[PDB]
Design a protein around this nucleic acid. Structure first.
Ligand SMILES: [K+]
Ligand SMILES: [K+]
Ligand SMILES: [K+]
Ligand SMILES: [K+]
Ligand SMILES: [K+]
Ligand SMILES: [K+]
Ligand SMILES: [K+]
Ligand SMILES: [K+]
Ligand SMILES: [K+]
Ligand SMILES: [K+]
Ligand SMILES: [K+]
Ligand SMILES: [K+]
Ligand SMILES: [K+]
Ligand SMILES: [K+]
Ligand SMILES: [K+]
Ligand SMILES: [K+]
Ligand SMILES: [K+]
Ligand SMILES: [K+]
Ligand SMILES: [K+]
Ligand SMILES: [K+]
Ligand SMILES: [K+]
Ligand SMILES: [K+]
Ligand SMILES: [K+]
Ligand SMILES: [K+]
Ligand SMILES: [K+]
Ligand SMILES: [K+]
Ligand SMILES: [K+]
Ligand SMILES: [K+]
Ligand SMILES: [K+]
Ligand SMILES: [K+]
Ligand SMILES: [K+]
Ligand SMILES: [Mg+2]
Ligand SMILES: [Mg+2]
Ligand SMILES: [Mg+2]
Ligand SMILES: [Mg+2]
Ligand SMILES: [Mg+2]
Ligand SMILES: [Mg+2]
Ligand SMILES: [Mg+2]
Ligand SMILES: [Mg+2]
Ligand SMILES: [Mg+2]
Ligand SMILES: [Mg+2]
Ligand SMILES: [Mg+2]
Ligand SMILES: [Mg+2]
Ligand SMILES: [Mg+2]
Ligand SMILES: [Mg+2]
Ligand SMILES: [Mg+2]
Ligand SMILES: [Mg+2]
Ligand SMILES: [Mg+2]
Ligand SMILES: [Mg+2]
Ligand SMILES: [Mg+2]
Ligand SMILES: [Mg+2]
Ligand SMILES: [Mg+2]
Ligand SMILES: [Mg+2]
Ligand SMILES: [Mg+2]
Ligand SMILES: [Mg+2]
Ligand SMILES: [Mg+2]
Ligand SMILES: [Mg+2]
Ligand SMILES: [Mg+2]
Ligand SMILES: [Mg+2]
Ligand SMILES: [Mg+2]
Ligand SMILES: [Mg+2]
Ligand SMILES: [Mg+2]
Ligand SMILES: [Mg+2]
Ligand SMILES: [Mg+2]
Ligand SMILES: [Mg+2]
Ligand SMILES: [Mg+2]
Ligand SMILES: [Mg+2]
Ligand SMILES: [Mg+2]
Ligand SMILES: [Mg+2]
Ligand SMILES: [Mg+2]
Ligand SMILES: [Mg+2]
Ligand SMILES: [Mg+2]
Ligand SMILES: [Mg+2]
Ligand SMILES: [Mg+2]
Ligand SMILES: [Mg+2]
Ligand SMILES: [Mg+2]
Ligand SMILES: [Mg+2]
Ligand SMILES: [Mg+2]
Ligand SMILES: [Mg+2]
Ligand SMILES: [Mg+2]
Lengths: 146, 64, 118, 205
RNA sequence: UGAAAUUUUAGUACCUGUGAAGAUGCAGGUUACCCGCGACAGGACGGAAAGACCCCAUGGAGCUUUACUGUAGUUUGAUAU
RNA sequence: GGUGUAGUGGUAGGAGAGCGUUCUAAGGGCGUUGAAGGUCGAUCGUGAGGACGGCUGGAGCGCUUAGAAGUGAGAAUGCCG
RNA sequence: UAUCCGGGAGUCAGACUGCGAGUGAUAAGAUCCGUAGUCGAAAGGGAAACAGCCCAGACCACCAGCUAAGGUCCCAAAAUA
RNA sequence: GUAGCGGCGAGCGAAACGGGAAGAGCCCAAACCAACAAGCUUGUUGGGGUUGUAGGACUCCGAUAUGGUAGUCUGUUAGUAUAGUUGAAGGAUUUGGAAAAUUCCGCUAAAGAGGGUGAAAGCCCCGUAGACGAAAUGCUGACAACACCUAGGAGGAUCCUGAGUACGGCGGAACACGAGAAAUUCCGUCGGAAUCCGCGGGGACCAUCCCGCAAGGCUAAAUACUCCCUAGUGACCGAUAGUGAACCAGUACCGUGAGGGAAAGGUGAAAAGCACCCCGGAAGGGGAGUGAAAUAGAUCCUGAAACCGUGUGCCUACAACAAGUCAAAGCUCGUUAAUGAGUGAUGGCGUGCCUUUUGUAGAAUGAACCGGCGAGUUACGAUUGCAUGCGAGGUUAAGUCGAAGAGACGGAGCCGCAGCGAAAGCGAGUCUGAAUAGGGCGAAUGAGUAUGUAGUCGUAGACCCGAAACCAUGUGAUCUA
């Protein structure tokens, strides 16, 4: 491109709308705020979720549950992703992290049976679903709980 | 600053897979003698935040 | 990046004032009075571009009526006769004939009366 | 692609081959534009401020009582509508610089270089050697290469005599092969690069 | 010698009517040559003061008390000296 | 681009497309043979608005593309003169 | 044209007329609903003037024509039909 | 914006891990030893010793080294700050009052940053690139000197290892944590330990396990800020702006005082600032001069509008006028040459602008007029549209290098690719349930993410102006009681 012939991509940039700049622009005078009221005042408006005094929805609804301090979440992996590897390959949490499939392993890798596996593999992971273990082993592979 | 979450809502609702919010039911605290067993049974079940209510409050749970 | 008032303000107001030349005193001298008057002038101008058509049709009708009376006819009877005789000459041309070509208008009136008789 | 290689005297040697991945791509105009705008914004210093009614000097007391005087009610002599009052909003110090995705940056650089090559505005020279810095000699070098428009002279690191001898020419912009930017390439109408500089560029990209 | 309040621009009539329901300005009619000077105060809902009466604001302030919640003081006990 | 048919009052308000102001970049220009500014004119466009002459003036300023805003006033018993 | 999904609103003082009711006194330019229209946010013609009634919805130019409500002796266009 | 805290409201809101900037560790008290002094201990002095894989004393052995320092107006030396020196290259022609402008040929450049010069200068001047420079006095760094720290091994019989302390009750306070189930830290008051088989902590508490060793002290760097000084920068202001203050400004002025607080820049290139003459007492003018220009004459660049006045082309003394517009005779004049311009007898129609209202010509509100100034912005987040890049992936943050740039590195972290459940947990399913039942939420039925931009929202004064008031320092009894 040439500095004297620049052209942005169509629709990439828009013109800011300025209010209170004459009537014919469509936002003159009231600047789109309407006529009087609380919402027409500078800094006006009510806090989010406010209902003008009617009991708000969250107040109506009860609190529920608790958070387990020892909660454990696992980074999930499916058989379709495992298909990306070659037969005889040793699948490991390190292997997954290097491949970029699992950037954050959380409490560990758990393998699920969402897809159809087609390659023989020795898979090492924190956990395996029962269906996932069966699929891996039926494909001639093996599973080891790291 | 970071937009803050409404902690009361965070305690009362759950984000579902499809983006909706799961909520408990009202009238499930006491005075059960005033409600038929059908009412109690059908209030035991959870429900979803209605469209109007969600459109009012979604910004308070953006980062829930 | 300050944008001081500049000259656009003076230019715009001067356009309004020039539009207001000939008005009475402050109505041509002062921008606010001039603008308020120029707006009313626009209102009157738009309204009068329609009223002007009405005025001239009214004038032509009156002149045609006088000429028809002199030829022994009312305006209404003349126009009815002309419609019967298929004459499409409009009121502007008819009024012009009445004032300028009296003989032509009389000939038109004769045909109108003949159509009425038939 | 391939570009004629020239000796400092101006006689052309055999062509040389440039990496297609760097000089052989189809330029992406929109990406180039984004890079230009981003770099130009980054150059801004953004030091500009005004005093609002809180910052203006004085202006504490109420000018006159709320009622009775017959004048318009006022709160401070420094309110924005007052002559000498604070400014409503207005400039405040801030940064205009942002960052594009690395991939977009790389694409922009490749696009400008590829565009130069395609137009044949890329002049590669075997080497630029000056026993001592002399702008007259470098100007003669440009004449030998038949370059008269705006030129970006890309030198390998350490070619201080070439850099010095060229810099003062009005139409010449000197940059080291390690430090070359989309804005520099786009500004220059022609790009005069030494062969070592091109090698180092290909390594960098 | 030389101000001021006021002031949308005014070539600034009367009657009856109309109209945000009390018109110099609108309708119909009537009256009236142009410009002033000295006087009067019916009107311009005349000027002056974002009505103090009245109502409203989840306004303010001072005051009262067996309003609510505190509290300085006063007093009583334990404990240390 | 042509034809045809239909449509084009409008407050709050939504959408779209533009005019003009200052500044930045690039390109391409104009200026003591007179820039900006001021003033007059019977000029052009659908609109905001744009030219071109005469006079005044005496040194800076347009145009095209893109960018950024202290970007447009007639009203606030607004402030200053 | 309807839905459904999403971005952005404004609105929560309504007025009158006709028709159907209540309240009122089978009063109010009263009040409160239902229903249709108009005004609100609608210029034009008629009703003397006259937001809400009658006719009728202005993108523009014309010194062209036909009609609506309402009119045709003069003001004042058109029948002393 | 998680875990949490919270009239579980409004809101408040961590820390550890991980990634970086910077990095440094050391002294006492005590045991014990020697001396001193008084009154076998008990104070002073010196030695000794300094800690958790427990250390130390003490007792045995062996080494009298090895290294370090956060010391010193100790020099020697270098550099640097505070003046400076040097520093290339143009003449003509046209316009002009003046050349840097125009035109023609040149020249210089490690210097084409910038400023000034009679208009716009690479080559006229000050400069710049570059080179060079310090008697004197600071500052820094090195070198040296002086100085101060700096021991290994083996044993435990015994001794030492911080007391009105830790801790507890009561009452407060700090920890994101508002007494709460409430640890941890601190204050006041009262009570009040153990001491190596000892003690503290791991969010009440206990046991086990792990980690540590309080009640003594010191410690550079990364970090915060800029009244000042030096050198610069700016899609920052350009005289109602920018500091209140471009000017003799915290001045004038106001107030008892605290305190409040202005206005006010521009002749010309050069004063060459109008000799002399004329009217006038002067002021002020008219000539005559200076000047390119004096309608640049000091109220001095330009010189708008309101406002005031002179001259006149047309009209106006029977007319009821929101002052116009439409139609039009007459008169006058001739332009961006256009089916022109000014004025206008006369005729038709016609109750301003704004705000606020169901409705305003309104006898409802606002504006005396003119000019200037004067109101949805920015930062950080949320969300949607549009755009670009990549795509089951997307992307870096801090930080390092770099021109205050781009860019490179930096994958810690964030979003997405799996959901369901309060949770254990299970998983293309899962939860409820006795259930292979039904049903809910999901999958089948996949697009996301980084950035730009625009709309809207949240936190911030959040579009602008406006209270009566509240609170915390001060100043006032020169009036008055
Ligand atoms: K809006
Ligand atoms: K719930
Ligand atoms: K209940
Ligand atoms: K009224
Ligand atoms: K009177
Ligand atoms: K009071
Ligand atoms: K002109
Ligand atoms: K603004
Ligand atoms: K005003
Ligand atoms: K919608
Ligand atoms: K009705
Ligand atoms: K947060
Ligand atoms: K609350
Ligand atoms: K020692
Ligand atoms: K000179
Ligand atoms: K110069
Ligand atoms: K020295
Ligand atoms: K506690
Ligand atoms: K612990
Ligand atoms: K520990
Ligand atoms: K002058
Ligand atoms: K005159
Ligand atoms: K008239
Ligand atoms: K009033
Ligand atoms: K089931
Ligand atoms: K199911
Ligand atoms: K995308
Ligand atoms: K976006
Ligand atoms: K604000
Ligand atoms: K806002
Ligand atoms: K006294
Ligand atoms: Mg923008
Ligand atoms: Mg609108
Ligand atoms: Mg307005
Ligand atoms: Mg308003
Ligand atoms: Mg309202
Ligand atoms: Mg509203
Ligand atoms: Mg209530
Ligand atoms: Mg229960
Ligand atoms: Mg019931
Ligand atoms: Mg202005
Ligand atoms: Mg018609
Ligand atoms: Mg203040
Ligand atoms: Mg007044
Ligand atoms: Mg200011
Ligand atoms: Mg009436
Ligand atoms: Mg009346
Ligand atoms: Mg009138
Ligand atoms: Mg009046
Ligand atoms: Mg009054
Ligand atoms: Mg009032
Ligand atoms: Mg229409
Ligand atoms: Mg300018
Ligand atoms: Mg502005
Ligand atoms: Mg004004
Ligand atoms: Mg009523
Ligand atoms: Mg309304
Ligand atoms: Mg109407
Ligand atoms: Mg109206
Ligand atoms: Mg007809
Ligand atoms: Mg007639
Ligand atoms: Mg008859
Ligand atoms: Mg020199
Ligand atoms: Mg020259
Ligand atoms: Mg606390
Ligand atoms: Mg205690
Ligand atoms: Mg404890
Ligand atoms: Mg340990
Ligand atoms: Mg430190
Ligand atoms: Mg100032
Ligand atoms: Mg000025
Ligand atoms: Mg000031
Ligand atoms: Mg002059
Ligand atoms: Mg002047
Ligand atoms: Mg008469
Ligand atoms: Mg007369
Ligand atoms: Mg009212
Ligand atoms: Mg007024
Ligand atoms: Mg005193
Ligand atoms: Mg005294």
């Amino acid at each position: 491109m040439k500095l004297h012939e620049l052209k942005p991509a169509e629709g990439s940039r828009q013109v800011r709308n300025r209010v209170g700049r004459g009537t014919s622009s469509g936002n003159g005078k009231t600047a789109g705020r309407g006529q009087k009221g609380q919402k027409a005042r500078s800094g006006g408006g009510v806090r989010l979720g406010f209902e003008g005094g009617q009991t708000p929805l969250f107040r109506r609804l009860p609190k529920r549950g608790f958070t387990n301090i020892n909660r454990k979440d696992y980074a999930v992996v499916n058989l379709d992703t495992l298909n990306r590897f070659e037969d005889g390959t040793e699948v490991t949490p390190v292997v997954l992290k290097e491949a970029g499939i699992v950037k954050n392993e959380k409490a560990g890798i758990k393998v699920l049976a969402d897809g159809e596996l087609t390659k023989k593999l020795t898979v090492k992971a924190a956990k395996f679903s029962k269906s996932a273990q069966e699929a891996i082993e039926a494909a001639g592979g093996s599973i080891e709980v790291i | 600053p970071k937009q803050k979450t409404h902690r009361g809502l965070a305690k009362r609702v759950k984000r579902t897979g499809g983006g909706g919010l799961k909520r408990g039911r009202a009238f499930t605290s006491h005075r059960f003698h005033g409600k038929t067993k059908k009412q109690r049974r059908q209030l035991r079940k959870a429900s979803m935040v209605a469209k109007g209510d969600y459109k009012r409050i979604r910004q308070q749970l953006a980062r829930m | 990046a300050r944008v001081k008032g500049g000259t656009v303000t003076r230019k715009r107001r001067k356009k309004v004032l020039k539009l207001a030349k000939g008005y009475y005193g402050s109505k041509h001298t002062l921008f606010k009075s001039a603008k308020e008057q120029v707006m009313n002038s626009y209102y009157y101008a738009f309204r009068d571009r329609r009223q002007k058509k009405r005025d001239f049709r009214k004038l032509w009708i009156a002149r045609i009526n006088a000429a028809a009376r002199m030829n022994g006819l009312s305006y209404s009877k003349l126009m009815h006769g002309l419609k019967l005789a298929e004459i499409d000459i409009n009121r502007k041309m008819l009024a012009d004939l009445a004032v300028n070509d009296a003989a032509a208008f009389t000939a038109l009136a004769e045909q109108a009366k003949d159509a009425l008789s038939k | 692609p391939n570009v004629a290689l020239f000796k400092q005297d101006g006689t052309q040697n055999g062509e040389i081959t440039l990496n297609e991945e760097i000089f052989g791509i189809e330029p992406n105009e929109s990406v180039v534009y984004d890079a230009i705008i981003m770099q130009r914004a980054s150059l801004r210093q953004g030091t500009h401020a005004v005093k609002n009614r809180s910052a203006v000097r004085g202006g504490g007391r109420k000018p006159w009582r709320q009622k009775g005087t017959g004048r318009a009610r006022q709160g401070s002599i420094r309110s924005p509508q007052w002559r000498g009052g604070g400014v409503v909003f207005g400039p405040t110090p801030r940064s205009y610089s942002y960052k594009f995705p690395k991939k977009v940056r790389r694409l922009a650089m490749k696009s400008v270089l590829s565009d130069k090559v395609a137009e044949n505005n890329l002049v590669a020279v075997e080497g630029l050697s000056f026993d001592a810095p002399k702008t007259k000699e470098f100007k003669q070098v440009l004449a030998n290469l038949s370059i008269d428009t705006k030129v970006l002279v890309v030198l390998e690191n350490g070619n201080d005599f070439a850099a010095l001898s060229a810099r003062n020419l009005p139409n010449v912009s000197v940059v080291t092969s390690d430090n070359v930017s989309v804005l520099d390439v786009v500004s220059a109408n022609k790009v005069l690069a030494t062969q070592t500089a091109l090698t180092q560029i290909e390594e960098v990209l």
